[PDB]
Amino acid sequence: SFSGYLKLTDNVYIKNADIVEEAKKVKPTVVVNAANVYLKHGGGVAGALNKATNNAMQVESDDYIATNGPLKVGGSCVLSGHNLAKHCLHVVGPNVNKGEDIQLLKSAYENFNQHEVLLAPLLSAGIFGADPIHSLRVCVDTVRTNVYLAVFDKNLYDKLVSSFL
């Protein structure tokens, strides 16, 4: 199962890892994507996960949006995990760089409670512009299911662990 994680709480674990490499290694039931409402996987975690699927994630996502329309900020959808996981849970955290409401981060993390165990990034972190320390706090205070967080940046991982209350 998941290896090398630091246990933060009863159900939240964290590791300095590339979520793509982690997903290819574990092949978890659920990998979370840091999605946008359009499922346009251009950069950050979404661009990296999509590139690992040879764009199959984007082709599937475009068919999903053509049928259903965009997701809501704070919402999610379950699609295939392709070569990375059984499923991909595409979760839309607020993008602070697009002037979106940071209060929607708790709603975004609530999507994780529909899955017993997940491999995930910190929502709204990175190119989404939120403070990753705040994202980890919301994660631990919202998610009740088993969440294995992959933090790509070593310096951020160390800052997250050393400042964890």
Ligand SMILES: CC(C)c1ncc(Cl)c(C(N)=O)n1
């Ligand atoms: C009825 C189908 C199209 C549906 N409705 C809503 C969602 Cl959120 C999902 C999903 N892929 O998780 N699928």
